[PDB]
Amino acid sequence: MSSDEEEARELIERAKEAAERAQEAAERTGDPRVRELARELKRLAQEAAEEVKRDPSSSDVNEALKLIVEAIEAAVRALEAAERTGDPEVRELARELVRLAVEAAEEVQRNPSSSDVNEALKLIVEAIEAAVRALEAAERTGDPEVRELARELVRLAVEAAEEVQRNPSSEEVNEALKKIVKAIQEAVESLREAEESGDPEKREKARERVREAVERAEEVQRDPSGWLE
């Protein structure tokens, strides 16, 4: 078996496992909307895998499948994280994140040759992963205020991700989401530091650190090109 052949077989298997996880996760939510989204994740994996199964010699087709599989895996993690929280607002944020993954994946499958559409999904996947980490970190604090701020922060990322999804070729919209993702990653790192500390003062510091990330993300959405920075 050649290298292209081996890579194809491996990716098709990875796609199958992803869609299967998506199936399982969605049926556990009992939300008919999430079941529909997971059905859509499965459909996209099969459509993208079917192209690779036909002809595994195209770099673009194999790259499209790989990115779509990464999007499904991230969507799966979002749904699993939401279920762990038992929190209805977090479940709704997860639904919103999964919907964005679906819509961005649909654009990739339709246009595998487009660098922009590829970049949009890539960045959106990174945003989903960062958002899930922020929500998980906030949940671990058990603190109502940190949790609420994390949700505010993820909503700003969702609104910026939608802009990217709808305008993949706009560099300004891309840079805005990158800045917000950076702010989320900084919030996550601050929460980790406070979590590994036994200092109550470090926990109040955490609230404020997440608050500063929210204020940063709000500033970015008001001035996405950083004209004022």
Task: Specify the amino acid at residue 201.
Answer: E
Contact of 123 with 160, CB cutoff 8 Å: no
Structure-determination technique:
X-ray
Q: ∠ at Cα 46 (42, 52), nearest 5°?
A: 145
Q: What is the 3-state secondary structure (H, E, C) of the chain?
A: CCHHHHHHHHHHHHHHHHHHHHHHHHHHHCCHHHHHHHHHHHHHHHHHHHHHHHCCCCHHHHHHHHHHHHHHHHHHHHHHHHHHHCCHHHHHHHHHHHHHHHHHHHHHHHCCCCHHHHHHHHHHHHHHHHHHHHHHHHHHHCCHHHHHHHHHHHHHHHHHHHHHHHCCCCHHHHHHHHHHHHHHHHHHHHHHHHHCCCCHHHHHHHHHHHHHHHHHHHHHHHCCCCCCC
Task: Specify the amino acid at residue 23.
Answer: Q
Contact of 15 with 62, CB cutoff 8 Å: no
C-alpha–C-alpha distance, residues 104 and 166, integer Å: 9
Q: What tokens appear for 135 in the block? A: 């929500």
The structural domains of the chain, with segments of one domain joined by +, span: 1-86, 114-229
Contact of 25 with 80, CB cutoff 8 Å: yes
